[PDB]
């Protein structure tokens, strides 16, 4: 749906993470979710990554929240991977089928690490008895993990769509790629 | 002025000023759905619900302020799917102040005046605590900001009886029953070319003294048949206007009305100069 507004004060958020979210948002946005669960799930991930970019800046109730957020994102990526392998299975182009499988057999890994990292950062949130360098590094591991995940899924969207035009005749599974424009 | 009418008026105005039934929920999960918010607020009557998914906030209009209060108390600092929600009254969007109304315009005539531009959320004239008489201004809030733009536009410079209305946005800066009462006054009906700020300002001190007082000088650099005054309290302005209005000065009887509360002398003067400017 709706475009992603720009930044401000504001806006305590972690920018690289909001950026990553925005990159995914912008790709998925162009598409209808009707008949396409990868798109539906991608949209949820980007919005969740946006929330993450706030939570990670610390605050009231952010620990429990940030841990669940990572879990929500992790669950959504599973659907993207699961659905993205069904597409690869039905695709007749080796190049695409291969990029598709590759770019998505890493997703679950990035996701698990996201939970682990979110939780570390979640435990640090508040405690001033934690070295600045230990938290900053925690944040950095998480930001970098978030970026891979956002990118990885964006690429899965783009490859899946590519495969749509290179699917076997009378396929048992297809995703609908219909624009959400003018 | 009866005291059963005074009280009923003042009473109505309060009910209006306090029927703040618009709430804001922040902290929602990134993947929250409207169904989720509607569920959360199922014991309440939702008149309107919009979820800003990118912000994790939900703008919700409940039946009335009593329900708003109950939602706020009940859910502020609650948890939804492990998230901590902040529940609180939405900020002021479309809140206009229509001033220079005829002092006799009723509350019903005011609603009639201001109601066409969209659905009103709150609408009230501002009366004197003692006399119970309209101070010549009121406040209109709409469900949509679009509505307030339409209104300001159609009402600024509108003739209503012997008056030309003035409209001014409340940004909003937030008001209390205290700020509802203006500290500024406008003097017009001044003699042609008249130049007695010293005399004019002298006249206006017969009760309390103006912290502000100036003539309307244009960027022509003409003189606009009016002046603007400020007083330390809304009470000092009140008494000043009561005594000053009608007074002879120059060959003429001065008209003395309140300015919309908010802006200080400096600003109102420009504001009025510029408004009447767009003639």
Curated annotation (Swiss-Prot), chain B:
Name this polypeptide is given: Ribonucleoprotein PTB-binding 1
Function, in words: Cooperates with PTBP1 to modulate regulated alternative splicing events. Promotes exon skipping. Cooperates with PTBP1 to modulate switching between mutually exclusive exons during maturation of the TPM1 pre-mRNA.
Subcellular location: Nucleus; Cytoplasm
Coiled-coil segments on the chain, per record: none
Residues in RRM domain copies: 21-92, 94-172, 183-261
Subunit structure, interactors included: Interacts with PTBP1, RAVER2, VCL and ACTN1. Part of a complex containing RAVER1, VCL and ACTN1.
Part of the full-length chain shown: 39 to 317 of 606
Motif (Nuclear localization signal): 7-22
